[PDB]
Each structure stands twice: as structure tokens, then as C-alpha cells.
Design a protein around this ligand. Structure first.
Ligand SMILES: [Zn+2]
Ligand SMILES: [Zn+2]
Lengths: 103, 48, 114, 8, 138, 244, 48, 426, 192
């Protein structure tokens, strides 16, 4: 227990997280309000041997985004946060990577 | 030249320096004349 | 034959004779890791360097408009008529005017030399 | 411009 | 069963501000990083100048464990943004922007040649003798 | 000029269509001073930023995890130098780039994009020095230039149709030497594109006219193909000296 | 045809590729003349 | 919808349209035009802002000791070509009159200069001198900034200029001068050549430049030494790859350079160099160079190795390390990156260079042709005048700095107008 | 160029050859030697070919198809499956194994085409290598009837046992590094 200690509890719990690459128009739409607590809805539909991921833009925000998955076996990624109280922590390990493409 | 079944009399090289070191200054005189004559008369040109 | 790396520092292992058991080893010089040699061969040199260039030929080459193609030689796998042929396209190939063939049509990429 | 034995 | 046709859809939340900034910690696959042995770790700004715009040094399990160096990503994402989705009891995805990207590479806990001795050894480039014995001597 | 090496002076094959073969000074500067061909153009330069942004949008993952992998990721996208990542699909990227060159969104007419199918590299050069020439575009065995374009150009004045509209339509394209290395050309449409004993059935471009390979001074030479080659150089030199 | 053979005569007129290859040959001849002058001049001065 | 056997009309109609829009000299003109606008602004922007303060030793106390003077060159302007008569009244200068009177057809160049002064009282003051005249740039005739531009043939005849005159030349001291395009080797491109008599069997060169913003070229060589040299260990090891990095006196082993970029592990270095680990031939090629650099296993040791061979030695060890690091970040592979974490990109590109050298050595790729005009670029009026203006504007900033430093050490004041020497650029 | 090809041998002619002769350059661009045959070898093509072979430099690299280095712990172990027979034969009455045997084996394989073109003999090559290098390199040669022409080279037996060296028991150049150096020396400097 020290200032430089890293809270590895997220790693111990093996929390899985998803990393997504999204375009600038979507991020700027989100940042416009950024305080309403809502930006859209993520819908995942699974079939017998195929899964598809899509994101629907909020109707207020607009005034379909398919997701393409990428293999994460070639690199191990983890997410760590630097708290404002100087308490570093680990949130989880990245188990899937995705990219958002315009329609 | 000293190899077996190689004619010692007529075996010659184009390198005038080798002809010097091996066969002497007179041999170089003749060999240099031969080489110059060859390069001059390859075109068919004749120099006295 | 190939080069293998250490499992601790990811440096290059080197072959070392085990004097006691007479078994070839690979040891990392920067640490104490050791692994027994399975292949038992170390240094192979092909002076004639005869290498099948079919390993060096890319299937994508079938998409080049600047290459010649014939319908005479069909592919073995799919029996496609178009086949794009080309010479070695390599330096230090000794003397080889042999034609290598690459099958057109998507994703077949079969390569035969006749 | 003629051949290999001639001139260029 | 339901697993062959399950459809899951979750709400997305993006808070305006978070007390803790979010970064990316990426390890090379060949390094074989394992968190089971990570009893303790120390992440701090480097002192190679012997702050916010300097690389990071990680020392896992103190000096006995492996050390890693992480460098921020030079290429800025002027036309890209990265977000992380985390499971929460409310069942809605939360997206947090990636403040920084770090690639951590390890340094072996092996004996390190001193600079003066290294220069002296390089003076004798033609090391006819075995290099492994030379390393053992050091 | 002092160097007597006969390597830098010789007419290289790549000079075709971009430097006059006949027009060179004679003396210490044979083959060292050259003249542009009639249709040759020299790139003025452009910012590579929009091309990089398009590549990022399409794919071209940079800072990947040793993904080349025997170039499993076909092709490595280069820009004016600067390896900027690689793509899994090279042919779709090349076709999309050509379509963009037609629409003139991100690719100006001068932007040069070369894919080396073997060795798997795409170079995408826009560096202000490249010498390029206009070539007609051949799709299948048919030139894209058609009677509509020629009729509109024939009425050029009071029809506000010009060469830039021909470029915008995608009928013609500027190709530099690097792209000339990857392009199948036909000297003439009728003689070559038309179906015969098939030499090539993959022509991608057609020369507007062969005579444009000559320069300004060699272009005045009448029937230059019936003269010995040094005589055309002599006439270039002497036509620079004519009184008028 | 690909490697430079010109089947047309001067009276008939060279085709464009034959024209370029003929230009390559003529350029080589001109370069040879221009390079020759200086080397031969140096040799002549040395001999004299 | 086709045009068969009517082609002889069609080709010459399209050629006519081409030469109607452009003309023959469009290279020169276009180059110059681009140059002016883009290049001048870029150069004025790219030059470092002038930083200046009085010497602390000269004056006692710290109340006003750092009077920081900062000069920034905001924006560029060019007027139409103008002649300033002896009376001083500006007049438009027609090209024909410049030829007749032996004048120079040039246009004045004005830069907005913002002077911000910090007196250490935190009351920084910004004063903007607008349209400050720094020099005169000769104007290429019939370019966009020439007076003859956009004039119909009747108007050209009124000015005693030929409608048929192409333009593309400058009138300097009354004489028409034509910039001749200069051939050069292509920049930011890896070319592998073989030199017969060199100690290297193959050499891969990259004449890297950062958009020609500065440093015309920064060439770096990666060359594989020939195995012709015979020695016991030399025969055992075979050919080794060395790097002729810029600003370094002698050769540096390539693996040491890779470790200086922070990639210490041999596996990572080979990942950058050998993209396919499965191929045995390239691994065997790279092995001896790894043997050569087995001594240095740390980034700091590699940086010290580079610094020791630097052209100017550093007395302090850490001084050498810092010098080597900054030299790598700036001079080596500038086009790839120049700052921050471009080290990974530089490592990838240097591995590409080594990989291309290995492919050439193995015969998998053919050696580049220097005469191939794809490997060549042509410097027109634009790049040449841009290089000239880079040099002269740097000298102008230097002279402004000298005058300013004198007047600041006095502490009296500084005047931008007196510091600028239009003689320099003009 | 444009020299008439009477024979397949290039010759400097014209101004460059005049430069060479006039400058008496130590290094001619194309040093050549015309050799006339004294006896019936001039008339008969086979004897002339024999003279040509005797006069043309031949290195071991020219006749070597491929070279490999195997760590063989025991001669009887025969890590390579093929040599198991002939090694056994040579070790039916082993020679020079009394001191010791090298644990490393250089198994050179020669191309039959080059061997028969130069009319070289396995005994000839083995004698040259063994005699020139000395007792240190021990060579086992295959029969010419065997499909593969194999030369198995091992480092000094007494040097392996180290009784002959005495002095300090310290490896010099290890053994495999020394064997690689030997291989390079044989490839470029054998002068068979
Ligand atoms: Zn290790
Ligand atoms: Zn097929």
C-alpha cells in the first residue's frame, strides 16, 4: 500500500472490456451535449453461427453504424486509470476490438 | 608455361608486365609491338 | 536450421555442446536459460542455392495487367483457362528462362512450372 | 543502330 | 437454446467528466505478460533527466519482478477517438475517451554490462574467444 | 560534364513521352541537358494530408502488431516516403483511389499512386517534382473517350468545355514514370485495342498521339521517322539557330 | 520488336517504338564521339 | 458511341484543347505561382519565433532583468510589381519599361510582425507592425502576380508586349533570365545500389527531407559490408550491416542503432527487420550483425556508443547520451518524424531499409536504377526560389537578432524597422 | 562492343587497350593468356580438355552442392540416416579415433555434375583437404557409386581429447565457430 501501487483488482476479477474506434463526427456529436447521459443505443444480434453488431444514433443527436470486429489474439491490451487522488487502478483487460464505419 | 603438354616456345600473354617479369626486356619490346600492332590493325588501319 | 529466441529476455540463443551428456543445447548469453536442441542440425548452407521460386511468387501477381497470359495451360485445381506466366524476375537466379505460371480467377493462386 | 557487330 | 438466437441491446452513457482519466496499456504478445504473479506494482514518471510530457516506468513486484517502459503514442488521433465499454450492474454500456495510449516493453532482470567495460570489450571487436564465457566473467 | 562515363548520358527507356529523345546538346553535355516533351507536365506539389485521412478512413491500420507477417497484409501503404500503415485488401484500395482521382475529392490529377503487386507496396507520391504526361484511359478494350467528349471539345469556345472537363470526366489521366512502369499502354486505339491475334487484352491506357514524345524543336522536323536519329538531334540544335 | 529490332526501312518510316529505340542507338553513338575526343587528345599529348 | 477510323481528328482535337488551356510554359509559371503563395507563407511560419532577453550579468537586480522580446512573423503580402522613383512615389512598372531602363521586375514583400514584450512584471505587451517591408521578390512574367496576367492580346499590344510571348522568365537588371529545371534524386525513397569497388557489397540510401521545410536533405546509409575481406572471425561471421548515420564520424552497427531507438530485445529488432520470421535465409543474413552488437544490450549504452563516434565529442557522458538522442530525433530519418514518439516509426522505417538491403543481397529484389526517371525529381522555379528564400530569410532573422541584441543589452529599446535589412533578401 | 566473337573471350580493344599498353598499367582490364599445346594433346580434344582442367582454378565451392554442420555426439550414433552405412564401414576398422573424435560434423555434399566435369576424384579432394589441413581435419568420403557424394569432416582428434594440447583446458573459438571458419576457408581457398 503506497502512492505508486497499482490497484490490480480489475485484473483479478478478469473484467472484460471492448475497445472501439469511432469517427470524429460521432464523437463530436457526443461532445456537443456530453452531459445529457445519453448518446445512442448499441444493438447486438446473434445467429446460429454469425453475430452482428450495430449502433443506432439518437434521434435528438442526429438533429445506422455497423461495427466490424477485429482479432485481439495478436496483442494483449489492458485499461488503467490515473485517479485524481493519485490512486492508479486497472479497469480490465480488452477482450474484443471493433471499428465503427459510416453508412 | 611450365605445365606439361604446354608449348614453352609459343605460349604468350597479353600482359606486358608479366612478359617483363618472366621473359625479359627484349621479349617485352616484341610483345608490346605485337599488342600495339593488334590494336591498331584491328580496324584494318595500317601504321608503318 | 532456424533461429529461436530466449523465453525470458527474448534474445538470441546460441548453440552449446553439453560436455557431460553429449546433447546439443541452446543457451542465452544474457541469462541462464537453456533449452535442449531438438533438430540436431545447426548450420546449413546451400551453395547452389537451388530454391523453388514458387515459394517466392505471390498469388496477387495474377492481377497485374502488364503480365502476359495464355489460355493454353489450365489450372490443376479449378481448371481455369487463363494463366498468367512470367520468368524468374529475380537477380542471382543462375540461368533460368523457365516460365512460372499463376492461375487467374479469384483466390485460386495455384502456381505450376512447366 | 544496325546490329551487334556493326555500329549502334 | 436461447444462446443460438439471443439479441442483446444496451443503453450507452457518456459522462461529461470523470475523476479518473482513461488510458490504454498495451503489451506485446511475445512478452507473455501474466497478471497472476503481479502481487504489487509501481508506476511512476521516469527520472532519466538525471513531468506530464515524459514516459512512464513500471516496476512489477518491486526490483525482483520485471520492469516495463511505456511511451505515449506519437501519432495523435486527430481524426480518430477510442472508447472502452465496461459492464455495469445497471446493464448499460459506458464509453470513456482514451486520454493516452502507452506501449509497455520489458527489460530483463539480468546482469547488465557496465558502459566502461562495454567500451573496452568493443575495442576488441574480434572476440575469437567465446562470448558466453566473457559474460560469465562479468 | 567532365565525367566521361557514358552511363548518365544515355537515353533511358523511362524518358519515353516525358523528355524529347532527339533534342539534346552536343559536346560536353550530350544527354545531360534534356528538354520536356510537348505534352509533359511537372507536378507542382500538394499537401499529403487529405490522402492520409482517406487512407485512415478506409483501413490502413498503423502501429499494428507485426501484421505484415510475410506480407499477409497485402501491400504497405507509403506516401511521399513515410510508411503510414498497411491494408489487407490492396486491389479495392487501388480502385477506390482511382475513382477518387476521377471525382477529384482527395486526389488531384497530379497525385501518383503506384502498387507493386510483387513486393506488395503502394507508394502514393505527391512530391512536387514528378514529371507526368496525359494518357487516355482504356476500360476493357474500349477507350473511355467517346463521340460526346470529342463533339463538345470541337465546339470548345461558346461551349465552355475544355481539357479540364475532359480530366474531370475521367476520360484522361496524368501518369508519371513510376505509374508508367505499372500501366499497359496502346500506341493507337484502332490498331491495338481492337480484337486481333491477342498480344495484350489488358490495356489500361492509350497514347493520345505518339508524335507528342518529341520536344519543341524536334516537332518542327517533318517526317522525323524517316531520318537517321543523330540527324534529328542536329536539326534540333540548328533550329534553335534559325533566323526568323 | 520488343527488344529493339527495326524491320521498317528509313523510306518506309519507323514505327513509334522503333523510333525511340533508334534514338537510343543514335544517342549512344553521339556519346561515344563526345567522350572519345578528350581521351584520345590526352593520349596524343602524352606520346608527343 | 465510339470514334473508329475517325481517330486522326479526335486525337488532334483533344491535343488542341490541351494546348489551348495550358500552353507550353505552364511548368515554370505554375511552379512560380505555387512557390510564392505557399512557400513564402510556410517559410515565414516555419522559422522559429525570435526569442530575446537582456544579459543577466550586464545589469544588477532581477526586477527588469529578463525583458523578453518575442518577434513573430504573422502573414505575408505581395503587391503588384512596383518601381519607386527617385522622388519616392510608387509607380506600376511595366515589363517593357523595366527592360528598357535596365530595372528589375520585382514586387515588394510585406510581413506582419508581432512584437510581444515581457518586462518580468507579467504585463506582456503585444504591438503589431502591419505590412512591414522586408524585401523585393522578382516576379516571373505572365505569372499570376505579373501585371501582364489576365490581359487580352489587345491590352498586351497597348503595353508593347507580344501576345505570343510565353512568359516564364524574370527581368533582372533589364535582362531576361530563365530558371533551368534541375534534376535531382528523389527524396524520402529507399534506393539500394551496388558499388563494385566499395567495401560494402550493397548500400541502401534514403535522402530524407521533411517536406523541404528545412535541411534540403538528410541522407542516411544502411550498407552491408562485403565478405571479401578475409579473417578468422571475419570469415566466420560473414557480411555485417553498418549504418552511416548523418552527423556521425564513422560507421555504426545497425543493431546498435535499433537499440538506441529503445528496442533492446533481439526478437523485437528482428520483428522490425524481418517481417516474416519463418524464412530462414534472411534470419541467417541478420545473425552476424546481431553478433557484432552483442556487447551493447541497453538503450543508454547504445546512445553513448553513438555519441562517442559523433563528430564533436562530448566531455560529459550524459552530455554524449543527450546529444545522440537529439541527433537521432532531428537528423536521422527526418521525414518519418522529428519529435516525441516517432521512435517507433523510425524503427519501422529503418527496419524496412535493412529488409530491403537483405532482399537485394538475397536477390529477391533487383537493384535500383539511378537513371530511372521515376527515381528523379525536377526542381523548377518554385523549389529553387524556396531554397533561396529559406536561406535569406534565416539570414534576415539573424541580422534582426544582432541589432536587437545590441539595443536590448543597452536596454533603451528596439525598433523592427531599423533591424530589417531589405538588402539581404532583395 | 561490336567486337567480332571469334571465341567466347572478351578482349580490350581500341582506345582503352591503347591506354593500358601506353600506361603499362599493372592491372589490365582483361588479362588473358593464349596457350598452345606441345604434343598430341593439341590434335586430340580429350587431352586438350585434360590440360584445360589442369590449367583452370577450381575451388571446393565450385564442386560443393551444399554444406551442413551437424552436432553428432557419437560416430556410431549417425544422426544423419544416410551416413549410417558408410560410417559403420569406416568404423569397422576405425582409424584416428584412438585419440578421440570431434563431436561436431561438417557434412559437405558435392554435386556429381561439377565433379565429373572437372574430373575430380573423391580420394583426390579428400587427400587435398586432409593433407593441406593436416591430421586435424579427418575426412570420410563416400563411394562414387553412392547417389550422394558426401565428405564428413571432423576437427582434430587429439585436440578433442586435449591430451596433446596440455597447457590450459580452455576452448579456443569453441568448436562450431572454428568449424564454420574452416568451412569458409575450404569454400574459397581450397585450390583443388
Ligand atoms: Zn535469455
Ligand atoms: Zn486455378
Amino acid at each position: 500500500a503506497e502512492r505508486g501501487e497499482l490497484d490490480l483488482t480489475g485484473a483479478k476479477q478478469n473484467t472484460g472490456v471492448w475497445l472501439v474506434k469511432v469517427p470524429k463526427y460521432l464523437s463530436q456529436q457526443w461532445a456537443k451535449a456530453s452531459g445529457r447521459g445519453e448518446v445512442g443505443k448499441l444493438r447486438i444480434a446473434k445467429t446460429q453461427g454469425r453475430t452482428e453488431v450495430s449502433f443506432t444514433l439518437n434521434e435528438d443527436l442526429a438533429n445506422e453504424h455497423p461495427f466490424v470486429l477485429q482479432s485481439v489474439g495478436g496483442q494483449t491490451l489492458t485499461v488503467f486509470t490515473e485517479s485524481s487522488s493519485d490512486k492508479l487502478s486497472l479497469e480490465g483487460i480488452v477482450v474484443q476490438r471493433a471499428e465503427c464505419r459510416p453508412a | 608455361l611450365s605445365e606439361k603438354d604446354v608449348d614453352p616456345v609459343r605460349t604468350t600473354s597479353n600482359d606486358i608486365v608479366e612478359i617483363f617479369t618472366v621473359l625479359g626486356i627484349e621479349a617485352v619490346r616484341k610483345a608490346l609491338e605485337r599488342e600495339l600492332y593488334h590494336v591498331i590493325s584491328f580496324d584494318g588501319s595500317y601504321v608503318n | 536450421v532456424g533461429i529461436r529466441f530466449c523465453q525470458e529476455c527474448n534474445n538470441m540463443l546460441y548453440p552449446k555442446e553439453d560436455k557431460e551428456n553429449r546433447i546439443l543445447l541452446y543457451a542465452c548469453r544474457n541469462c541462464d536459460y537453456q533449452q535442449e536442441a531438438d533438430n540436431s542440425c545447426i548450420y546449413v548452407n546451400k551453395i547452389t542455392h537451388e530454391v523453388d521460386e514458387l515459394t517466392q511468387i505471390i498469388a496477387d501477381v495474377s492481377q497485374d495487367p502488364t503480365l502476359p497470359r495464355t489460355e493454353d495451360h489450365p489450372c490443376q485445381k479449378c481448371g481455369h483457362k487463363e494463366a498468367v506466366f512470367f520468368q524468374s524476375h529475380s537477380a542471382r537466379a543462375e540461368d533460368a528462362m523457365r516460365l512460372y505460371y499463376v492461375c487467374t480467377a479469384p483466390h485460386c493462386g495455384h502456381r505450376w512450372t512447366e | 543502330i544496325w546490329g551487334i557487330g556493326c555500329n549502334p | 437454446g436461447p444462446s443460438s438466437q439471443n439479441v442483446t441491446e444496451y443503453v450507452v452513457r457518456v459522462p461529461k467528466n470523470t475523476t479518473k482519466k482513461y488510458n490504454i496499456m498495451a503489451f506485446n504478445a511475445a512478452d507473455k505478460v501474466n497478471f497472476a504473479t503481479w502481487n504489487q506494482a509501481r508506476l511512476e514518471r521516469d527520472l532519466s533527466n538525471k513531468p506530464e510530457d515524459q514516459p512512464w516506468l513500471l516496476r512489477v513486484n518491486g526490483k525482483s519482478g520485471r520492469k516495463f517502459k511505456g511511451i505515449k503514442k506519437g501519432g495523435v488521433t486527430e481524426n480518430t477517438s477510442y472508447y472502452i465499454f465496461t459492464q455495469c450492474p445497471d446493464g448499460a454500456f459506458e464509453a470513456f475517451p482514451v486520454h493516452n495510449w502507452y506501449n509497455f516493453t520489458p527489460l530483463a532482470r539480468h546482469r547488465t554490462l557496465t558502459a566502461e567495460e562495454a567500451e573496452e570489450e568493443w575495442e576488441r571487436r574480434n572476440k575469437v574467444l567465446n562470448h558466453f564465457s566473457i559474460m560469465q566473467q562479468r | 560534364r567532365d565525367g566521361k562515363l557514358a552511363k548518365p548520358r544515355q537515353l533511358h527507356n523511362t524518358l519515353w513521352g516525358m523528355v524529347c529523345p532527339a533534342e539534346t546538346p552536343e559536346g560536353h553535355a550530350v544527354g545531360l541537358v534534356k528538354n520536356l516533351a510537348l505534352m509533359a507536365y511537372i507536378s507542382v506539389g500538394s499537401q499529403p494530408s487529405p490522402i492520409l485521412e482517406f487512407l485512415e478512413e478506409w483501413s490502413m491500420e498503423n502501429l499494428e502488431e507485426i501484421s505484415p507477417a510475410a506480407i499477409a497484409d497485402a501491400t504497405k501503404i507509403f506516401v511521399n516516403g513515410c510508411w503510414v500503415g498497411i491494408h489487407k485488401d490492396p486491389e479495392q484500395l487501388m480502385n477506390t483511389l482511382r475513382k477518387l482521382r476521377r471525382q477529384m475529392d482527395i486526389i488531384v490529377s497530379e497525385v501518383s499512386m503506384i502498387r507493386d503487386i510483387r513486393e506488395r507496396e503502394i507508394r502514393i507520391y505527391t512530391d512536387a517534382g514528378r514529371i507526368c504526361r496525359p494518357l487516355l484511359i482504356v476500360e476493357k478494350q474500349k477507350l473511355l473517350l467517346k463521340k460526346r467528349h470529342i463533339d463538345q471539345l470541337k465546339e470548345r469556345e461558346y461551349n465552355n468545355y475544355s481539357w479540364q472537363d475532359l480530366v474531370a470526366s475521367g476520360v484522361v489521366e496524368y501518369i508519371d514514370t513510376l505509374e508508367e512502369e505499372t500501366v499497359m499502354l496502346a500506341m493507337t486505339p484502332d490498331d491495338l485495342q481492337e480484337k486481333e491475334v491477342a498480344y495484350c487484352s489488358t490495356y489500361t491506357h492509350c497514347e493520345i498521339h505518339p508524335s507528342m514524345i518529341l520536344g519543341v524543336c524536334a516537332s518542327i522536323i517533318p517526317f522525323p521517322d524517316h531520318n537517321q536519329s543523330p540527324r534529328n538531334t542536329y536539326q534540333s540544335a540548328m533550329g534553335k539557330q534559325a533566323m526568323g | 520488336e520488343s527488344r529493339g529490332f527495326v524491320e521498317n526501312s528509313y523510306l518506309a518510316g519507323l514505327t513509334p517504338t522503333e523510333f525511340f529505340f533508334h534514338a537510343m542507338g543514335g544517342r549512344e553513338g553521339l556519346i561515344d564521339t563526345a567522350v572519345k575526343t578528350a581521351e584520345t587528345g590526352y593520349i596524343q599529348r602524352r606520346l608527343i | 458511341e465510339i470514334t473508329p477510323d475517325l481517330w486522326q481528328e479526335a486525337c488532334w482535337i483533344v491535343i488542341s484543347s490541351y494546348f489551348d488551356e495550358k500552353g507550353l510554359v505552364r511548368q515554370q509559371l505554375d511552379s512560380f505561382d505555387e512557390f510564392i503563395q505557399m512557400s513564402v507563407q510556410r517559410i515565414v511560419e516555419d522559422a522559429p519565433p525570435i526569442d530575446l532577453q537582456a544579459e543577466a550579468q550586464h545589469a544588477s537586480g532581477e526586477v527588469e532583468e529578463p525583458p523578453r522580446y518575442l518577434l513573430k512573423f504573422e502573414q505575408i503580402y505581395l503587391s503588384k510589381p512596383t518601381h519607386w522613383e527617385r522622388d519616392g512615389a510608387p509607380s506600376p512598372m511595366m515589363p517593357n519599361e523595366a527592360r528598357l531602363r535596365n530595372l528589375t521586375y520585382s514586387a515588394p514583400l510585406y510581413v506582419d510582425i508581432t512584437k510581444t514584450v515581457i518586462k518580468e512584471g507579467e504585463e506582456q505587451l503585444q504591438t503589431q507592425h502591419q505590412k512591414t517591408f522586408i524585401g523585393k521578390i522578382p516576379i516571373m512574367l505572365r505569372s499570376t502576380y505579373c501585371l501582364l496576367n489576365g490581359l487580352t492580346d489587345r491590352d498586351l499590344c497597348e503595353l508593347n508586349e507580344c501576345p505570343l510571348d510565353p512568359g516564364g522568365y524574370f527581368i533582372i537588371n533589364g535582362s531576361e533570365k530563365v530558371l533551368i529545371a534541375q534534376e535531382k534524386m528523389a527524396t524520402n525513397t529507399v534506393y539500394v545500389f551496388a558499388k563494385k569497388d566499395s567495401k560494402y557489397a550493397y548500400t541502401g540510401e534514403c535522402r530524407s527531407c521533411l517536406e523541404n521545410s528545412s535541411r534540403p536533405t538528410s541522407t542516411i546509409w544502411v550498407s552491408m559490408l562485403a565478405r571479401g575481406g578475409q579473417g578468422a572471425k571475419k570469415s566466420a561471421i560473414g557480411q555485417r550491416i553498418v549504418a552511416t548515420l548523418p552527423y556521425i564520424k564513422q560507421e555504426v552497427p545497425i543493431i546498435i542503432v535499433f537499440r538506441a531507438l529503445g528496442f533492446v530485445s533481439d526478437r523485437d529488432i528482428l520483428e522490425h527487420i524481418i517481417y516474416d520470421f519463418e524464412d530462414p535465409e534472411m534470419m541467417e543474413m541478420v545473425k552476424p550483425s546481431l553478433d557484432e552488437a552483442f556487447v551493447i544490450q541497453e538503450q543508454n549504452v547504445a546512445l553513448n556508443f553513438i555519441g562517442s563516434r559523433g563528430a564533436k565529442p562530448g566531455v560529459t557522458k550524459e552530455k554524449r547520451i543527450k546529444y545522440a538522442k537529439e541527433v537521432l530525433q532531428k537528423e536521422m530519418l527526418p521525414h518519418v518524424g522529428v519529435s516525441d514518439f516517432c521512435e517507433t516509426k523510425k524503427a519501422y522505417f529503418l527496419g524496412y531499409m535493412v529488409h530491403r538491403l537483405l532482399l537485394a543481397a538475397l536477390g529477391r529484389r533487383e537493384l535500383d536504377d539511378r537513371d530511372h526517371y521515376g527515381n528523379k525529381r525536377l526542381d523548377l522555379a518554385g523549389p529553387l526560389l524556396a531554397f533561396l528564400f529559406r536561406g535569406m530569410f534565416k539570414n534576415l532573422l539573424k541580422e534582426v537578432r544582432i541589432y536587437a541584441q545590441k539595443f536590448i543589452d543597452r536596454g533603451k529599446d528596439f525598433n523592427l524597422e531599423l533591424a530589417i535589412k531589405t538588402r539581404i533578401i532583395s | 562492343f561490336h567486337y567480332a566473337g571469334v571465341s567466347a573471350k572478351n578482349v580490350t580493344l581500341g582506345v582503352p587497350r591503347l591506354k593500358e599498353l601506353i600506361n603499362i598499367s599493372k592491372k589490365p582490364k582483361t588479362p588473358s593468356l593464349t596457350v598452345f599445346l606441345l604434343g598430341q594433346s593439341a590434335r586430340d580434344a580429350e587431352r586438350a580438355k585434360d590440360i584445360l582442367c589442369r590449367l583452370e582454378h577450381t575451388t571446393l565451392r565450385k564442386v560443393t552442392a551444399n554444406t551442413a554442420i551437424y552436432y553428432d555426439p557419437n560416430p556410431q550414433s549417425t544422426v544423419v540416416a544416410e551416413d549410417q552405412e558408410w560410417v559403420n564401414v569406416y568404423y569397422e576398422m576405425p582409424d584416428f579415433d584412438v585419440a578421440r573424435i570431434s563431436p561436431w560434423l561438417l557434412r559437405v555434399e558435392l554435386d556429381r555434375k561439377h565433379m565429373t566435369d572437372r574430373k575430380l576424384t573423391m580420394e583426390q579432394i579428400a587427400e587435398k583437404i586432409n593433407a593441406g589441413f593436416g591430421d586435424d581435419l579427418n575426412c570420410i568420403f563416400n563411394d562414387d557409386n553412392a547417389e550422394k557424394l558426401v565428405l564428413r569432416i571432423r576437427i582434430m582428434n587429439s585436440d578433442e581429447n586435449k591430451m596433446q594440447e596440455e597447457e590450459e583446458v580452455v576452448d579456443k573459438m569453441d568448436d562450431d565457430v572454428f568449424l564454420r571458419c574452416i568451412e569458409s576457408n575450404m569454400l574459397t581457398d581450397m585450390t583443388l
